[PDB]
Ligand binder design. Structure first.
Ligand code: BEF
Lengths: 102, 97, 119, 79, 67, 75, 66
DNA sequence: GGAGTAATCCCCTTGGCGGTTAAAACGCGGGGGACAGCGCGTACGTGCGTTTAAGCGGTGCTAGAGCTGTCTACGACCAATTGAGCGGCCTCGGCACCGGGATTCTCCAGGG
DNA sequence: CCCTGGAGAATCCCGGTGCCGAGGCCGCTCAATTGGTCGTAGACAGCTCTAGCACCGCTTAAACGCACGTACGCGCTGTCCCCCGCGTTTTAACCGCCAAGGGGATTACTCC
């Protein structure tokens, strides 16, 4: 493959063309054009582990968007990154106030 | 007539409505409101297929977050349920304009 | 329809999805999530359109027992007449001109009746 | 060929409150939240029509909703 | 056409051999991964223009500040 | 200017920031801007909690008034 | 901040009736916001190929989030 | 012998209905939510007798700062070859909400 | 009156058992190699230098009590309101069903 230089496996060719021509830096001079794919592999692996754990539980084997919404709201680093996003095909965090409650 | 105390049966309503992926918004007229909004000024949209679901879920996010902020401001006051003044508190502090 | 799509996927909350030509055509992606034991159509003379997207919807339906309920198969245009068999089970070869068409139609209609007789 | 709203439910607005953490109700729960909906949506579409009338151009594929709502103040994921 | 899915399942086999996931999760993966890519590219664009030094440290600073 | 005098806030800033990096230093600038921004945030929170107290039927704001002022202003 | 500065703040202070409450509250997030802004400044000035904080490398410190 | 006129395909709309369920609302009971005035006191109110510090201004250079020769250290063209995962498919493991079975959730009128 | 015998309701442990389901597997193909070319970002040596910090030497600006002293925080208490509970009913989007012309493309037929 063209990605196994440092444990990566995502496609490189089109990614090499895009990162080299990212239109944001004049030249990536020594230089980590593959670090975008590195963080991409990192996120893919963490999503793999989380989704496997979620699907394997609930006595099922599939990921319902409810589970992914719960996982997205679960993390704190993702909340600090972009905390102004919501997940569709699910529901809001359940809530009842003790003052609302009888 | 097994009529029990309201608030606890409202509590079981909350429990049922806050458990699964159920679409609590009986809201194709929400889609018609979106259509009236979109065709209010322009025309010939020619959009995607499931985009209505995404925009409606964004509407749900905004409105429901407003709901929880309003309930927090309401229990902040001496009134548990949703009050318009609590919603004004929840929206003005957000920088509504 | 999503308000009754919550407790709807698996159980016999519907013993049968009476899914007309309405929901099959436009939601072939959504109709690729749950098992379906049976597959039928009504008066399939008007569904002669083999190149319709409903064909793509119902082709991927890996059903153990298909079926077809046609009001009246036509008398000419052998292609739409074998379209019933093709919808029933896509197992026959695409070519059908070997039976008739180019090489006196009494034998042709007799062969049509014969190849229909079991089905 | 235009259609308009009728009031936004007793029941569905009630479930909106239910997932908002509300069991009973006041007289200021159903209607006004929809008014906030209308005000926020009219503001975001005001910005959108300003954008599309300053240059007089159409829009692009479904990726617009996530970016426009993020600038608005409440965006979405799901696809 | 091009699918990251095969590489994703390779990483899964590195982690878990026989687990199945859903397509909606794959679409959300596409969306969030690509918007992370856009944000990380946007963050490390003119940092090399902050001072007259215009690499790897740009994206390193990007991940340092976004996280 | 600096209602809280420049030297107290300078001492606090230096004491707090000494732990990040050794031998950290500032130029002639970046002295009075931090307190000005902090006071701007404080005044915005004051306006928000004053509005909340106006709603709360009591001029006296409280812990929860300021909590609502800070939380719903954006963060 | 000390008692007289908070006293003037409470003099503004919604007819002064909010004095004690703001006296107790406004000092809680002072250090938190100060730490946040100085940490952001440190992160911005990390990539400056210099040895001290300069205004050159902190112009676009919060360009990501405004 | 490729284009000019025009006969062909055709499919896609401009629009109006079968079939259709949810969408908003009624509707009655009441009891919990609606919103506040007082009790009084505690919760703040406040203005002048009593000081460290703050924001400095009197030399000499004094940690970081901008500084111009002339380059050391590198990152992007083309040309014949070729391997990664894509171009298309759907295989064997494990699915997927109300039933077999009903104790939970919630109130109420007599035991007490 | 407490405590409770008895009344109402409702979906959690694992399937319905036939198919969802993710990207292995057929290998090929299109931008990566290495065959040479090529001049630009980063920078080492270089020189005092910006404003004022070490002394001295500051003048009051906040910063601290007192002596009472004078009103409102949260819930009692009050009506009061009041709108869901969840069954029931009527406004209410979407998606095939219809039979046609426009017209872009596209070649039958042809022609200068
Ligand atoms: F089903 Be029919 F009327 F042929």
């Amino acid at each position: 493959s063209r990605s196994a230089k440092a444990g990566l496996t995502f496609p490189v060719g089109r990614v090499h063309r895009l990162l080299r021509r990212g239109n944001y830096a004049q030249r990536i001079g020594s230089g980590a054009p593959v670090y975008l794919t590195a963080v991409l592999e990192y996120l893919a692996a963490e999503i793999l582990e989380l989704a496997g754990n979620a699907a394997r539980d609930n006595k099922k084997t599939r990921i319902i968007p409810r589970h992914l919404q719960l996982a997205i709201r679960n993390d704190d680093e993702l909340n600090k990154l972009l905390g102004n996003v919501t997940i569709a095909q699910g529901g809001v965090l359940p809530n009842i106030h003790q003052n609302l409650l009888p | 007539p097994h009529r029990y105390k309201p608030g606890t049966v409202a509590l079981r309503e909350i429990r049922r409505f806050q458990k699964s992926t159920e679409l609590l918004i009986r809201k194709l007229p929400f889609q018609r409101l979106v259509r009236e909004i979109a065709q209010d000024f322009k025309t010939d949209l020619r959009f995607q297929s499931s985009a209505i679901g995404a925009l409606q879920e964004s509407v749900e996010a905004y409105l429901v977050s407003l709901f929880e902020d309003t309930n927090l401001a309401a229990i902040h006051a001496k009134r548990v349920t949703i009050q318009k003044k609590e919603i004004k508190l929840a929206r003005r502090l957000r920088g509504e304009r | 329809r999503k308000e009754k799509r919550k407790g709807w996927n698996k159980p016999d909350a519907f013993h049968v999805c009476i899914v007309s030509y309405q929901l099959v055509v436009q939601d072939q992606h959504s109709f690729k999530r749950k098992r379906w034991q049976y597959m039928v159509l009504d008066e399939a003379h008007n569904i002669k359109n083999f190149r319709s997207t409903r064909w793509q919807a119902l082709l991927n339906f890996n059903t153990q027992r298909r079926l077809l309920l046609t009001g009246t198969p036509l008398q000419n245009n052998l292609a739409e007449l074998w379209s019933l068999l093709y919808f029933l089970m896509p197992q026959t070869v695409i070519d059908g001109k070997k039976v008739s068409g180019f090489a006196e139609t009494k034998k042709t209609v007799a062969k049509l009746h014969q190849v229909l007789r079991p089905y | 060929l235009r259609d308009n709203i009728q009031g936004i439910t007793k029941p569905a607005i009630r479930r909106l409150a239910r997932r908002g953490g509300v069991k009973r109700i006041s007289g200021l729960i159903y209607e006004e939240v929809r008014a906030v909906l209308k005000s926020f949506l009219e503001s975001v579409i005001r910005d959108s029509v300003t954008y599309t009338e300053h240059a007089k151009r159409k829009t692009v594929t479904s990726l617009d909703v996530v970016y426009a709502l993020k600038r608005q103040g409440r965006t979405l994921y799901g696809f | 056409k091009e699918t990251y899915s095969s590489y994703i399942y390779k990483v899964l086999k590195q982690t878990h051999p026989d687990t199945g996931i859903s397509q909606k999760s794959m679409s959300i993966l596409n969306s969030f991964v690509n918007d992370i890519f856009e944000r990380i590219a946007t963050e490390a664009s003119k940092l090399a223009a902050y001072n007259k030094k215009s690499s790897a440290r740009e994206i390193q600073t990007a991940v340092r500040l976004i996280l």
